[PDB]
Design a protein around this nucleic acid. Structure first.
Lengths: 22, 133, 83, 190
RNA sequence: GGGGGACCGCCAGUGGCGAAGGCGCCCGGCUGGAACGGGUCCGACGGUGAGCGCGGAAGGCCAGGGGAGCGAACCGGAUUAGAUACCCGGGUAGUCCUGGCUGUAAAGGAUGCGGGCUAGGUGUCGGGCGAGCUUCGAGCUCGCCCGGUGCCGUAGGGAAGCCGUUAAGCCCGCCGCCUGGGGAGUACGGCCGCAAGGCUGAAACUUAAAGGAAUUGGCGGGGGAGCACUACAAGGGGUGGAGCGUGCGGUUU
RNA sequence: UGGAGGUGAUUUAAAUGC
């Protein structure tokens, strides 16, 4: 679980933060 | 031959004891001359029988005919194994070799705990939950 | 960059326990990457799968799906046959 | 390789400078002069009490070979895993005691002693048992000849003298010479 | 025989020290804390502590130096229905050193700190004391006391497990935090950070649960004990091969 | 009589059910 979520949250964050940074 | 006073030779026998193979190796008391080297995977055809006791008597019987051939009748046995890499404890050729020497007729002097044992730590493999099964 | 096109045979197959599988064969192994293609296709199908020699295999019937996904990627509609 | 056997020479070990020419040790080897520094392990049957009993394994080294006869000095001592594990106990201590020696003969000698403690109260008297070894030893080396000084240590004489002094301070048990190593040979004048 | 880097089994303890992260070859120098006996000196100077400031494993990052073994990523083999794995053979970053940054954790005793009060027992570490022993050294032991570190347990508390003079009792002082679940530890905004990220922190919407302890049963690719003859071994015979008898599946009607 | 550590560990036993 919290492994999952942390990396899902991180990937969401990055990918989206990539989309914001871009 | 420069005159011998004792008329008895001695050959220390290193015994290297793995769970993957057994090696028996008798040399002269100095250690500077190798009469004979015989392991447990010339005897056989397969990997499973590479160790066991039965290779670790037969390996220790072919050698034993060449030490009789020199004059070596007394033997000290120096039991040892890989200690730093793996577990120090000897495998199935240790009870085997000493049985293989009493049948061959070579006399048995000293039997010795000389296995590599670190006074210290070195990281082997296998972590997180160690090595996993 | 490159090009390359090939004749594509798609069909139902067979695996162990569990359902049938879908074979996609006939891609040019020099030019085309079956490993990049297949990662893309396992995403479309949502199935496990592999590159099995010169083929991609996909667990379950995906035959209309894949043709529809292959033609999108710029492969020819006329080189593809679903059997 | 393909020795008749007739490329096999034989030498004989005569090891003095701790005792006389101990005849024990017989040497086979192939070619002439490949053993001139090779090391031989012996129990020592000179004194059949202690030197056979609790002093199992000493290393001697053929410094020279003459007319095909090996002359051998004291190179080292080492005890077997047998000894060190057996003696040690719990809720007490095991100690170890180095000293880098200089005797008046111009030999240096590295000793490590091992004593086992009498039960409770581990303290600064431990290292002071350490201190009372390196003090007494230095003084015996400076006084005694080297050949003698390698007979005494290997014998229990040293373990015995250590105990008398150290039992005044903080009583001990199972004290020994774990190992010895020849620090420097050469001489006082090279 | 030589060279290199890492580390210091047993010792080692239900042991000690540390605020905490944490800390273990030996020797010496410098240095922090701590115990006890004597309160010998100061004379309420105390507690706590928002803000604020400081220390903080491993991983990561930066610059320089180093690199044995080990080893994310990675490269092969096997396994497997497939294996981006467990198992095996190589292998970079890193792991080490120096300077700096970063600041997170099931960072636990899941238990903020200080004072007072409230049966006991036992083991243990260190300090004190009265004795006996002594190798004349608190070395081996008995008991009271002080400080710490475990276990067991009365009264009480607790939902229960448990806790129970090292409180989760009973009181008094302060501080942080919580206010059903999921949305979400996310968005936005701001602050901090080289970067990786951290700190702070919602709402729309949705649900009759989320949860905790213990009880029973069933279950587990768990362990002990014991039997069996629809069990298996041991053993004797035989079915499955043929022909026929029979009942069936199917097909035919 | 009931509790805490240190390390052997065992692959000969296979995904799913409204």
């Amino acid at each position: 679980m919290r492994w999952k979520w942390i990396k899902k949250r991180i990937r969401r964050l990055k990918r989206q933060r990539k989309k914001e940074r871009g | 031959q420069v005159n011998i006073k004792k008329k008895e030779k001695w050959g220390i026998a290193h015994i290297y004891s793995s769970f993957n193979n057994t090696i028996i190796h008798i040399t002269d008391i100095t250690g500077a001359e190798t009469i004979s080297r015989w392991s447990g995977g010339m005897v056989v055809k397969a990997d499973r029988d590479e160790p066991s006791p039965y290779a670790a008597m037969l390996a220790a019987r072919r050698a034993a005919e060449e030490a009789l051939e020199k004059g070596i009748v007394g033997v000290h046995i120096r039991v040892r194994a890989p200690g730093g890499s793996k577990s120090k404890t000897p495998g199935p050729g240790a009870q085997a070799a000493i049985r293989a020497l009493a049948r061959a007729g070579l006399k048995i002097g000293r039997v010795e705990d000389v296995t590599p044992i670190p006074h210290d730590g070195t990281r082997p493999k296998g972590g997180r939950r160690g090595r996993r099964v | 960059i490159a090009k390359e096109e090939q004749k594509i045979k798609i069909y139902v197959t067979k695996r162990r326990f569990g359902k049938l599988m879908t074979i996609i064969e006939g891609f040019d192994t020099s030019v085309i990457d079956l490993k990049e293609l297949a990662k893309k296709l396992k995403d479309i199908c949502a199935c496990g799968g592999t590159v099995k020699d010169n083929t991609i295999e996909l667990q379950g019937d995906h035959r209309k799906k894949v043709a529809e996904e292959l033609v999108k990627m710029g492969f020819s509609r006329d080189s593809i046959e679903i059997r | 390789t393909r020795d008749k056997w007739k490329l096999k020479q034989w030498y004989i070990i005569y090891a003095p400078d701790f005792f006389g020419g101990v005849e024990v040790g017989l040497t086979p080897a192939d070619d002439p002069e490949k053993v001139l520094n090779r090391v031989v392990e012996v129990t020592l049957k000179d004194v059949t009490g202690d030197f056979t009993k609790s002093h199992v394994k000493l290393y001697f080294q053929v410094y020279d070979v003459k007319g095909q006869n090996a002359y051998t000095k004291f190179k080292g001592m080492k005890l077997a895993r047998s000894y060190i594990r057996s003696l040690v106990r719990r809720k007490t201590t095991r100690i170890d005691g180095i000293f880098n020696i200089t005797t008046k003969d111009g030999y240096k000698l590295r000793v490590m002693a091992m004593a086992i403690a009498m039960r409770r109260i581990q303290t600064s008297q431990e290292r002071a048992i350490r201190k009372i070894m390196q003090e007494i030893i230095y003084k015996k080396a400076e006084e005694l000849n080297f050949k003698d000084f390698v007979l005494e240590s290997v014998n229990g004489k040293i373990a015995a003298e250590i105990a008398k002094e150290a039992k005044k301070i903080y009583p001990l048990r199972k004290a020994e010479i774990r190992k010895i190593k020849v620090l420097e040979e050469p001489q006082v004048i090279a």
